[PDB]
């Protein structure tokens, strides 16, 4: 039931995961990738419903590139900013409720946090599903990456963050969920005809496991006042 998507190589993503931290992109971006991969496949098979997704990152490379914004009306460019970007090469192991080759490739989603994500044609051989986690993780090639596990250590402050960033120099903080500011209401203009509330980012610390299967798998958790992509093991 564990469908394996290998070598999802994003070229130009965003490193501004919060308005506060830079680094690996946010975990509502990796969630929205999978729930676009689910929701495409629900055109044919209306009960696909990924439960959780295992992330295996190789090769971040965060960098300040540029962003030439488009000319907007007196016709000149808008205000000049600064933008961090990253070039992720990760691999993804899902967890399905229960499919051809050519159904999967045309129903992959094509943007992971503003960046074009692709599988090479020669890597299409590795989209096959399995039944046991121990074979699905030994299945994918280019083995040399770290699984994402949240560092569930009590924290309240930036010094709480920076102290844990030196005992583990590979610990990376980014945006994990959205902390609201009011209850969602009906507005006259909303994103796709739903209820709209104003949110703020939530910053957590993120481990890396060598390989607790539940802890590795992430899912969307709804809290009456926030929404955080947690692992299953919390």
């Amino acid at each position: 039931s564990f469908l394996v998507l290998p070598n999802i190589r994003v070229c130009g993503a965003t490193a501004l995961s919060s308005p506060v931290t830079v680094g690996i992109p946010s975990l509502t971006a990796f969630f929205g990738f999978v729930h676009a991969f689910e929701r495409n496949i629900n055109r044919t098979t209306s009960s696909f419903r990924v439960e959780s997704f295992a992330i295996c990152v190789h090769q971040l490379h965060v960098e300040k590139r540029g962003l030439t914004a488009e000319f907007v009306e007196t016709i000149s460019a808008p205000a000049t900013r600064d933008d961090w970007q990253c070039d992720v090469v990760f691999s993804l192991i899902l967890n399905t409720n229960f499919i051809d080759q050519d159904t999967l490739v045309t129903s992959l989603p094509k943007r992971l946090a503003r960046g074009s994500a692709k599988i090479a044609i020669d890597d299409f051989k590795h989209i096959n599903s399995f039944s046991t986690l121990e074979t699905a993780i030994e299945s994918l090639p280019i083995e040399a990456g770290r699984w994402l596990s949240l560092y569930a250590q009590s924290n309240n402050n930036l010094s709480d963050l920076l102290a844990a960033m030196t005992e583990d120099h590979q610990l990376m903080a980014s945006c994990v969920g959205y902390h609201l500011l009011e209850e969602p209401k009906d507005k006259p203009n909303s994103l796709r005809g739903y209820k709209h509330a104003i949110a703020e980012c939530i910053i957590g610390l993120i481990n890396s496991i060598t390989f607790d299967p539940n802890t590795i798998f992430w899912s969307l958790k709804n809290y009456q006042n926030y929404l955080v992509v947690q692992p299953r093991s919390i």
Binding site: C11, G12, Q59, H61, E63, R65, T68, D87, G115
Partner: peptide
Amino acid sequence: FQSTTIDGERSPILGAF
């Protein structure tokens, strides 16, 4: 120059835009 990490080298790239 813009760059990406291929293997262990820095390498000049051309953008996605």
